[PDB]
């Protein structure tokens, strides 16, 4: 049988082990926010190399053939 | 505080405490899924800048050749 002072005591570790766990998931939701930012940031990224990338050859190869031409 | 009052605080810490350790581990699995994506699409970024800049760079080259050999034959 738990004491009314046994109570008091687990309670107390309770709230510290609380408190340490809290500071745990803050920082892991923390992560989760940056890391879904990088996410989406190089999503769009990689995007618009893209589009550029093949804006850039294709008016590239119509100097060439026409210069050919 | 009665006994049954710290009964149930205490109790109620313990059950707060296992919600908070299941939302844990999912937002961990989140973040793993999210640092493997990340690192993937890094390379890929890296690997097409440079594939994008050999093309690049080799239709310079052939622009300025054909642009020197036109000027040399006239």
Redesign the interface.
């Known amino acids: 049988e738990?004491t009314?002072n046994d109570?008091?005591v687990?309670?107390g570790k309770?709230?510290l082990?609380?408190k340490e766990?809290?500071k745990?998931?803050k920082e892991?939701?923390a992560?989760?926010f940056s890391?879904?930012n990088?996410?989406q940031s190089?999503?769009k990224?990689?995007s618009a190399?893209?589009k550029t990338?093949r804006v850039?050859?294709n008016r590239?190869?119509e100097?060439?053939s026409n210069?050919?031409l």
């Open positions: 738990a009314y109570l008091q687990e309670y309770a709230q082990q609380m766990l809290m745990k998931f892991i939701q992560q989760n890391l879904i990088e996410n190089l999503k990224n990689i190399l893209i990338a850039e050859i590239k190869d100097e060439i210069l050919h």
